[PDB]
Amino acid sequence: ATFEIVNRCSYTVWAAASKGDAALDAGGRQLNSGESWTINVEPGTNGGKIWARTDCYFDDSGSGICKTGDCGGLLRCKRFGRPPTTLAEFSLNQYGKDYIDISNIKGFNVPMNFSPTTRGCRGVRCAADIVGQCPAKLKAPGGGCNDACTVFQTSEYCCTTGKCGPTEYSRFFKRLCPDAFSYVLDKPTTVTCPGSSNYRVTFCPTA
Template sequence: MASFKLSIILLSLSLLHILSGVYSTTFTILNKCSYTVWPGILSGAGTPQLSTTGFALQPDESSTLDVPTSWSGRFWGRTRCAQDPTGKFSCVTGDCGSSTIECAGGGAAPPVTLAEFTLNGAGGLDFYDVSLVDGYNLAMTVVPQGGTGGNCRSTGCVADLNGACPTALKVMSGGEGGESVACKSACEAFGDPQYCCSGDYATPATCKPSSYSELFKAACPRAYSYAYDDGTSTFTCASADYVITFCPSPSASVKSANGEFPSALEVSAGTREASASFIGCFLAVMAVMAAAWTLAGH
């Protein structure tokens, strides 16, 4: 009986350990745009797909996601989305080709602003960045909350690059006379290896910033502007949660600790609760622990 009791207790401790690692990081996605944004999510190779891969966020609405330990992937915002008479869902920018609101493993069609993460990487640090390598469609910031170590700072692109986009890179909506809704990368616009860092330009020594990438970098100094823009664009943090904000408004928002980007701490009534599976696991662990406590004679 004593060995049985000990086994139950060890099982309880093991389940608690597993539970603590199932959801290690919380992401809050906040839409401060004046229009609906449909976030898209793509998990990296070898990491689990999250509970959702796409949904709608109304203006000032937020959503929270619990993300597993050692997850990697990317977030982005889709705009001007609609469903046609046949039920096919598509977006003018950031479309993931799934024909549904859920991206279901589909990546973002450029041009699109990307927030990229590798959690619990080298040295136990999270690595994250906001990238304009695939172009730009939305202003976006990433703000770590409660993290330590590394270069644990806010990053992103708060500028509206659609209006300032060079004519050769602009994506127009509504044809001639329409408005600029996205800004292509030079690689996508021209396909030249020197802009794409491919072929003879596939190394940091041969692929240098172009006049186009320098425009992105001047407007958004902490965002990736081309493939080898690592030094000023990759950030690290340990044990942090993250707030991803679309269309941040620095003049109207609480500032982050470094005073440069909005912290976006406010969470609207639209915030989603923790997943039911997480709550179920927690209740199961508590039940096992209670049984172990009873068997131990308490």
Template sequence: MAFRLHLFSSFLLILITILSSGPNAAEGARVFTIINDCKETIWPGVTPGDNFNGGGFELKSGQSVVFNAPVGWSGRIWGRTGCKFDKNGNGSCQTGDCGNTLKCKGSGETPASLTEFTLANLDFYDVSLVDGFNLPIVVKAFGKGNCSTAGCESDLRKTCPSELSVKSNGKVIACRSACDVFNTDEYCCRGIYGNSAVCQPTYYSKKFKNACPTAYSYAYDDPTSIFTCTGSDYIITFCASNRKQTVCSYHGRKLICSGANGFRSLVGRWWGLMLALVLMTNMWVIS
């Protein structure tokens, strides 16, 4: 009988990050909690990845990890699947590969679901399927302002049109974009289609949008796909099956959780740390 650390594993990681960084470092950075709710191991990639374990790491099913990113960081985070790496971090992935290495130095190969961030006085963030889809991914923001949830909960691998499907051993492992497959100006929003007035949703982008209404489905899908938040921390969940599930982050000297009733500040700083430690000793789930 195996045991795994479930959702609240992120608490201890947050505590370690905060206590090891010191109060000034924590307050001057954004906290990123990355959770793998998929049934399989994934290998998140990050670029630029200096603040994220060098740009890549393994994340088993049910695990989570926490990083600090400074204001001014602008980059992307995605998931890789079907990876095999040796002890030196050399290897390859079926989807999202970034140059046959565990620690990504560049963007992942298409198709891949992407989260994109620009951290400033006003943060901008989104989830993009413009380069295709390989994993469901959701971004929750804890901050002030709009701070809407972005992402794609649906598994488009199950409904991917056959002409866009990427298969391995007869199983669909990713869904390519129409631009990637057909390489036309219309699908790629280039040439005479290189502006928002002319480049409009297509049959394929509409299928993506209907399944994932808060994710980019094509290049000029800005109005319903890009979000802003002030002074925010972020929870990125792969394979989040229910947006109302409880997820927590340590933000603004408080442990804050979201659930069916929205965001709630549970307790102050030190009581929050004590509560998190208590939760850590009791929230083991049999799997």
């Protein structure tokens, strides 16, 4: 499966691709406005995540800081980015099928469009201006909009035992972005796609 990552945002983003334990292809690249970054994700990839890191600085070695989505300080990510981050989550080749979705479970930082380039399935979009309408407590001082579990650390927001339900802060992400996951046990908006499909992740699709 080939993923094309496009930065349509006016500002520079540092795209990142990782499955938590290892990197996906390069695992991270600076994306100027309008730049497209093509990566090859190995088939059978389970639980891969693509997100955008904003306001990043890096030395020649590749170690630096990001205001949102920093993955241990490295340009090329080996683990998942730190909240808040809009997440494009995909599981490839799962019994002859592919599974994609966009998640606000870890907050929000950049509007995202996750669409398949090949025929078969529909794409997901979370392009609502969540940061502007972000509630006061969920506001991350370094940009973006945090989730509830990151801010408050309670069994209800975090769904530790998988018995939680919707809250104030989950319904906020749900009302702005209906097509994305607001919390762990949210009704699945995951789109099923033909196996071995190709995708495109776009930051700021509407603008």
